[PDB]
């Protein structure tokens, strides 16, 4: 069951580090749909958000 | 004098094992070639163990009880080398990876028989 689709929260923001940190590994890697329970649309959107955060140094690479 | 870091470079050809200080100055090293091997026998877990043991029992020049170990490459001798460093009489504190992975940067050379 997807978080965002089950909760109706459609927007994702690259600044909610506390909520995006649930989906990066300890080594800094995004995780797949089957492991995170997400859906396709929101998983694209989480990729975009995570990458913007990483490039703002808000999340790490490693 | 109390703790060191071990760097093992294990490959499908040879195994190097270097003991250094935590801020990166060499104290000792060894390999299968300095151990006395000459061919594919370099690439073996036995050579890995023996070079590890020689390295550690020279590292007991300035002394230590503890190691953090860092493993590089696909060489099969990492298990034997880590067992060597545990069983020589040192408390290996943790194992870690130095897999030099590029995120699709510079390309490899060609495959074989092409």
């Amino acid at each position: 069951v997807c978080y965002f689709t089950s909760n109706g929260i459609t927007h994702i923001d690259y600044k909610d580090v506390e909520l995006l940190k649930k989906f990066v590994s300890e080594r800094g890697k995004i995780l797949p749909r089957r492991v995170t329970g997400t859906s396709a649309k929101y998983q694209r959107k989480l990729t975009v958000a995570i990458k913007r955060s990483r490039q703002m140094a808000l999340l790490p690479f490693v | 004098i109390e703790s060191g870091i071990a760097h093992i470079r294990s490959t499908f050809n040879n195994t190097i094992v270097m003991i250094t200080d935590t801020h990166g100055n060499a104290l000792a090293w060894s390999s299968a070639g300095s151990l006395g091997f000459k061919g594919s026998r370099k690439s073996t877990p036995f050579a890995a163990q023996m070079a590890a043991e020689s390295a550690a029992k020279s590292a007991q020049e300035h002394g230590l009880k503890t190691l953090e170990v860092t493993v590089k490459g696909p060489g099969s001798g990492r298990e034997a080398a880590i067992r060597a460093l545990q069983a020589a009489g040192l408390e290996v504190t943790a194992i870690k990876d130095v897999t030099p992975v590029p995120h699709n940067g510079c390309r490899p050379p060609k495959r074989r028989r092409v």
Binding site: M56, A57, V62 | -
Partner: protein, 93 residues
């Protein structure tokens, strides 16, 4: 068009210096064809990795409206050229 901006100011800056830099980039945005509706801070928070010997930094926000984007472009080049902004980003809503 609704524009959002974020940026990071370095740690070695006192409060007067820092507010001067903030106000200066705000002036550069609003003196052009744009009007800052809001500009904000999180705080001197920890960077996920080190850009320089620096590892802390001042996270700031600017919510904005604009049509020309020369504000965006001057802000971008001037913030890269200044020794105070190590990071900034601009996004269209």
């Amino acid at each position: 068009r609704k524009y959002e901006i974020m940026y990071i100011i370095r740690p070695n800056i006192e409060e007067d210096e820092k507010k001067a830099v903030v106000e200066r980039f705000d002036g550069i945005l609003t003196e052009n064809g744009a009007e800052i509706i809001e500009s904000k801070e999180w705080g001197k928070r920890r960077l996920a990795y080190e850009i320089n010997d620096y590892r802390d930094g001042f996270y700031h926000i600017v919510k904005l409206n604009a049509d020309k984007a020369d504000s965006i472009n001057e802000f971008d080049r001037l913030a890269k050229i200044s020794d105070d902004i190590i990071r900034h980003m601009v996004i269209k809503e």
